[PDB]
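BJ4_G0041530.mRNA.1.CDS.1, pasting as requested.
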Amino acid sequence: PYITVGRHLDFLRPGLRFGGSQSSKYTYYTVEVKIDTVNLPLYKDSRSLDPHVTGTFTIKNLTPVLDKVVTLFEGYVINYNQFPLCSLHWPAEETLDPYMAQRESDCSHWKRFGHFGSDNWSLTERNFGQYNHESAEFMNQRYIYLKWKERFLLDDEEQENNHHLEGASFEGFYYVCLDQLTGSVEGYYYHPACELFQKLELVPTNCDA
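Structure tokens follow.
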């Protein structure tokens, strides 16, 4: 048989479904997420450059007419060595361009989750001074950090996304923090040309599998 040991997390595994909300200026819109594939960055190899998580993102009842917008998304998990908190120190590859942001934006968005200590903060460090080798490895830390980017839209055929929708625009990306103890997921949507700090909250729904 295939050995699945070490490739998945308890709350990050194929088939798992999250449900919750996205809050955008005092309005909450229901959200469904399905985790399709997980490839944790255990080591720095060729496959480590491929997306670490792939899944589906759904927004329901956006407008009285839309009622459903579904996208396929990729994403990368923050291991503190090869995929540090600051995107400026990510591997120099073209495929990582959609996940890039200025160091100030990365620092503030990672800090807002509130799970980091208040001391030893450095804007210029690759991990912002929040990681040392005496601290536990990323997989064993309580809080997992990810970046999610929606790469395809579809109604019946796939479309790449310079694209517009009524009430929606797929140009930014998601800072994501997963709690490994409770399974809850928090997130912030980011784009310089958008209003900052649009919130996302999620909890696993089909965990009893």
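Note for the archive: Residues 17-78+138-204 form one domain.
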